[PDB]
Design a protein around this ligand. Structure first.
Ligand SMILES: [Mg+2]
Ligand SMILES: [Mg+2]
Ligand SMILES: [Mg+2]
Ligand SMILES: [Mg+2]
Ligand SMILES: [Mg+2]
Ligand SMILES: [Mg+2]
Ligand SMILES: [Mg+2]
Ligand SMILES: [Mg+2]
Ligand SMILES: [Mg+2]
Ligand SMILES: [Mg+2]
Ligand SMILES: [Mg+2]
Ligand SMILES: [Mg+2]
Ligand SMILES: [Mg+2]
Ligand SMILES: [Mg+2]
Ligand SMILES: [Mg+2]
Ligand SMILES: [Mg+2]
Ligand SMILES: [Mg+2]
Ligand SMILES: [Mg+2]
Ligand SMILES: [Mg+2]
Ligand SMILES: [Mg+2]
Ligand SMILES: [Mg+2]
Ligand SMILES: [Mg+2]
Ligand SMILES: [Mg+2]
Ligand SMILES: [Mg+2]
Ligand SMILES: [Mg+2]
Ligand SMILES: [Mg+2]
Ligand SMILES: [Mg+2]
Ligand SMILES: [Mg+2]
Ligand SMILES: [Mg+2]
Ligand SMILES: [Mg+2]
Ligand SMILES: [Mg+2]
Ligand SMILES: [Mg+2]
Ligand SMILES: [Mg+2]
Ligand SMILES: [Mg+2]
Ligand SMILES: [Mg+2]
Ligand SMILES: [Mg+2]
Ligand SMILES: [Zn+2]
Lengths: 63, 87, 117, 272, 95
RNA sequence: ACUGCAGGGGAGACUGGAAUUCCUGGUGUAGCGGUGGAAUGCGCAGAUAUCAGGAGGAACACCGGUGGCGAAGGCGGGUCUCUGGGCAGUAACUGACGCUGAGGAGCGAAAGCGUGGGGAGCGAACAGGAUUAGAUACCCUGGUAGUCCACGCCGUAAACGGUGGGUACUAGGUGUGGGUUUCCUUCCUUGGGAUCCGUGCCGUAGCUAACGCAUUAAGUACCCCGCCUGGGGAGUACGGCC
């Protein structure tokens, strides 16, 4: 888990450069087992991705 | 709710000796404040059954404590009833 | 009497039929020959042979209108989903890119009940 | 909001009445009152043109302001919510800051004491009156004008509202309470919000006398008349009318709107 | 008073000049109620990931206010009521 | 009590996009739909298909699991407001204030009921087609109540772990969620050990008719409560309460 490995690296819905990973090529959130995030940081990533999609910084579906 | 300082005014007013937090009187005062506040919460949101259950648990605990203080010292019991309220 | 050099091919392949429609890049249809339009009927409309026949019919009808290259959008859980592309290729058209546009709800409308067959 | 009578007499068994809890100052404003007299459904010839009217309590008209044009930018304060026998909605008395008294139809959520604004620079709050150009789409409005400066005509009953659909060039699209899509000029005015007293339709009048008070006279079914009086009359026992249902003047049921009326250009979809 | 972070998307037809003074009124509605406005950072035009109100562009602004909940509710009601605002998103920078 | 911690726990308000349906317009022409195979059906008065715009309701893909929270029923689009409980650490406070609980009260899936609203999709009843000896069904085409919302009622489920609550004790092995913590403190490993609270699998003693349970007991004991006494008749009649 990167966020456990190095602390004080905030997850936020405005940091699209960090959220570009953890989303598939089609814009779907990557599974926990393929990114190695812990449960809490996986939840944080999913929340940030959902908010970014909602506020239109990321596509809902990059078909 | 009941932030730290908010509990502090109650503890200063109802505790016994400058550090009392677990006496029956202090506990009954805190429970009464929580019960009141949760009652104004429940006047709106009539369908918050999950919080009404917490209200019920607090009421039960306060009833045990009032019974205990009545058993142990009726004068303290009477003074606390007059300071807070009954029935 | 039209002339559209570049177009799009939509192939809707269901469990019961297949429809091939050729449009201009703006969404206006040129030719649309389908599996039932080709001589077929009933459950034969789902076989890959019917799909490739319909693809040939549509491809030649569009070439008659002046199409040389089509982009392909396929959708549906059909069987002729690749045979139609192959027929479009080997009936005088070049396809290039192929896209999947099967509609995927985000857990929306309730589906019909499961068949107890 | 509806109070139910106890079944003390046969005439009050299922009856109900308003609680009148929103009403303050049970008396009207003396300078805004004009007289009315009943007409029994009689026209200038003295003949009955509308049946089933007459009787009923004496009423006094209260001057309702349906224009709201001359006080743009002047704010008003709601002083009282009062009863009005002439409509189903309650009315509010406004004290303008210049010192003028006016009645407007009380919207939903216009408690006494609130401030009310008019004109293009007013907030989108219940009781504010704006031109349709200034109201964002998707808003519930009432007391809408059909022509600029013509006065409020649409959505004045209790509980009514009009849902503003959108403004294209110079026309607004409205969904009226009947559910039909009409198109009006964007220079028309409307009041923001929904008309109050929305629960009054649940009132059960208990007895015939209570309707006589409101001024409705009894209605005789046409099938228990004689053939000279109604097309449904006649028969030996009781009948269904010996023909397809018709009006007392022989008109059959069916659409009665003029087919080539001049306002068809403004009607997008007829009601369902 | 709590720390809130309001991010706004505005109509691309607006020029990036009058945007700073335009929202000063929505900031004064907070200042009168007795809040603080720390950073009013502006991002400028960016291409939205999808069509919002038939605009493929928009001006992103972050408000970063700190005031009472009723004041913030009044603020975002006024913004959503405004015609130049496309989207509004209010969050708490603390828990 | 203080300090931290995790959480689809609850209620209210606002709000997002995918998709289905319908409406308007463009292109366009003869089929579409459906099945084991068909027919009913829709269409040729311009359908299906495809593109743009609009309306409206309901459910929230990926995250997502065996995982979390809740007394149970149950709980996952987002944000804000209000609100309940749990765990760990400290040991600051009270000083047995505990446990259970007949009756009683509250909560309690879905279907159902009342008043009002809403109604995309699905779909009891109902209709047609098909199959069949028949087909009041299964399959197909439609389709009303209902499903949704507000406010009340109802009080039942294979409401299940088919296992009442509390407490102590009795080998281990191996996953996973939430803490604390020295040492190995970098062996950067966020690995190992120790401890507390959960949630799984496997296993000794022991228990069991057997199946199996097995530190989350169905083992060893103590406290309180509910229930059983052959199968039907019957959770039915009569009486009563709601
Ligand atoms: Mg005369
Ligand atoms: Mg009449
Ligand atoms: Mg009659
Ligand atoms: Mg007679
Ligand atoms: Mg006569
Ligand atoms: Mg006659
Ligand atoms: Mg007759
Ligand atoms: Mg007769
Ligand atoms: Mg007869
Ligand atoms: Mg009849
Ligand atoms: Mg609700
Ligand atoms: Mg429809
Ligand atoms: Mg069309
Ligand atoms: Mg179409
Ligand atoms: Mg001591
Ligand atoms: Mg108990
Ligand atoms: Mg009992
Ligand atoms: Mg209940
Ligand atoms: Mg139900
Ligand atoms: Mg109902
Ligand atoms: Mg019924
Ligand atoms: Mg109803
Ligand atoms: Mg159906
Ligand atoms: Mg069916
Ligand atoms: Mg039948
Ligand atoms: Mg039972
Ligand atoms: Mg269950
Ligand atoms: Mg049982
Ligand atoms: Mg137990
Ligand atoms: Mg036990
Ligand atoms: Mg474990
Ligand atoms: Mg035995
Ligand atoms: Mg086992
Ligand atoms: Mg046993
Ligand atoms: Mg019985
Ligand atoms: Mg009985
Ligand atoms: Zn982590």
């Amino acid at each position: 888990c990167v966020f456990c490995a190095k602390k004080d690296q905030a997850i936020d819905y405005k940091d699209t450069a960090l959220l570009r990973t953890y989303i598939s090529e089609r814009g779907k959130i990557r599974a926990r087992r393929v990114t190695g995030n812990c449960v809490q940081h996986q939840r944080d990533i999913a929340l940030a991705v959902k908010n970014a999609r909602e506020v239109a910084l990321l596509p809902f579906t990059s078909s | 709710a009941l932030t730290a300082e908010q509990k502090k005014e109650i503890l200063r007013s109802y505790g016994l000796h400058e550090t009392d937090t677990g006496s029956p009187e202090a506990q009954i005062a805190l429970l009464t404040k929580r019960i009141a506040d949760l009652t104004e919460h429940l006047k709106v949101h009539k369908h918050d059954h999950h919080s009404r259950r917490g209200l019920l648990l607090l009421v039960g605990r306060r009833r045990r404590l009032i019974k205990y203080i009545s058993q142990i010292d009726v004068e303290r019991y009477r003074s606390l009833i007059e300071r807070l309220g009954l029935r | 009497k039209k002339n559209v050099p570049h177009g799009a091919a939509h192939i809707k392949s269901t469990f019961n039929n297949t429809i091939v429609t050729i449009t201009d890049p703006q969404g206006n249809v040129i030719a649309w020959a389908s599996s039932g339009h080709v001589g077929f009927k009933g459950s034969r409309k789902s076989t890959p042979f019917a799909a490739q026949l319909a693809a040939e019919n549509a491809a030649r009808k569009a070439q008659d209108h002046g199409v040389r290259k089509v982009d392909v959008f396929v959708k549906g859980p059909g069987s002729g989903r690749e045979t139609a592309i192959r027929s479009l290729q080997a009936a005088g058209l070049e396809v290039g890119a192929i896209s999947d546009v099967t509609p995927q709800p985000h857990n929306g409308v309730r589906p019909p009940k499961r068949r107890r067959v | 909001a509806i109070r139910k009578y106890k079944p003390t007499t046969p005439g009050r068994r299922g009856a109900s009445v308003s609680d009148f809890a929103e009403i303050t100052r049970s008396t009207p404003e003396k300078s805004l009152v004009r007289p009315l007299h009943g007409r029994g459904g009689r026209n200038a010839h003295g003949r009955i043109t509308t049946r089933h009217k007459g009787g009923g309590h004496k009423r006094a008209y209260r001057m309702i302001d349906f224009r709201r044009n001359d006080k743009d930018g002047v704010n008003a304060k709601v002083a009282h919510i009062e009863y009005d026998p002439n409509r189903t909605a309650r009315i509010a008395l406004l004290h303008y800051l210049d010192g003028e008294k006016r009645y407007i139809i009380a919207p939903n959520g216009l408690s006494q004491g609130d401030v009310v604004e008019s004109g293009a620079n007013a907030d989108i709050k219940p009781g504010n009156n704006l031109p349709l150009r200034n109201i964002p789409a998707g808003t519930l409005i009432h007391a809408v004008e059909l022509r600029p400066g013509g006065g409020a005509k649409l959505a004045r009953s209790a509980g009514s509202s009009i849902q503003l659909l959108g403004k294209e060039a110079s026309y607004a699209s409205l969904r009226m309470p009947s559910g039909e899509i009409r198109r009006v000029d964007v220079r028309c005015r409307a009041t923001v919000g929904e008309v109050g007293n929305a629960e009054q339709a649940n009132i059960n009048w208990g007895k015939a006398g209570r309707m006589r008070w409101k001024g409705k006279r009894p209605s005789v079914r046409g099938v228990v008349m004689n053939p000279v009086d109604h097309p449904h009359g006649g028969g030996e026992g009781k009948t269904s009318g010996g023909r397809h249902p018709v009006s007392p003047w022989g008109k059959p049921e069916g659409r009665t709107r003029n087919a080539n009326k001049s306002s068809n250009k403004f009607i997008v979809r007829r009601r369902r | 008073m709590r720390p809130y972070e309001i991010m706004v998307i505005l109509d691309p037809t607006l020029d990036e000049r009058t945007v700073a003074p335009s929202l000063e009124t929505f900031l004064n509605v907070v200042r009168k109620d007795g809040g603080k406005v720390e950073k009013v950072d502006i991002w400028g035009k960016r291409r939205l990931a999808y069509e919002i109100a038939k605009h493929a562009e928009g001006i992103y602004v972050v408000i970063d206010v700190k005031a009472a909940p009723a004041t913030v509710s009044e603020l975002d009601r006024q913004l959503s009521l405004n015609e130049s605002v496309l989207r509004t998103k209010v969050m708490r920078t603390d828990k």
